[PDB]
Amino acid sequence: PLMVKVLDAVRGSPAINVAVHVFRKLTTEEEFVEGIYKVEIDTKSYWKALGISPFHEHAEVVFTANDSGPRRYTIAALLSPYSYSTTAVT
Template sequence: MAFQSVFLVFLAGLVFFSEAAAPDSADSKHPLFVKILDSVRGSPAPNVPVMLYKEAADGSWELLNSKQSNDNGELHELTSKEQFATGTYKIKLDTFSYWKKLGLNPFHHHAEV
């Protein structure tokens, strides 16, 4: 159980928001970059379901997109530059399904950043 808690602490700290792509690169269309690492196994966390939400005017959360991390634990296409307007966002990582696929009993069902 303790190692799963440690994983989640590192997992929450390893979500990156980046607009550092060169203007003409393929990633320049995608201003949000997510990298998920499994610090317990020392490797990327593939196939983790990730949901992107934006806070609405009434304080509720609107689901904008959902995808899974690739084999490198990365997501590049959660939103486009045009859709990524000023506001408050959160990312929800479905850690429950990740741990279940590894045959482990999850301590947390998800992590929000």
């Protein structure tokens, strides 16, 4: 007998994130769980899994990556529940 009990009774005014998981029993992936609460911000990726035998013979390649600019990211209360408070971005 397997019994999972999460947050039986709630009677206030909470701010709650819940995640309950129960299990019983070039690239390869199998029977996984990923990114339940994932925040990806300004994520880069240039070359990935190009394939089998890229640029096999006599290949001349020039690679350049210039990340250069005025960028502004302003975040308040990321992944953070709250209650009876004041979140202000002035």
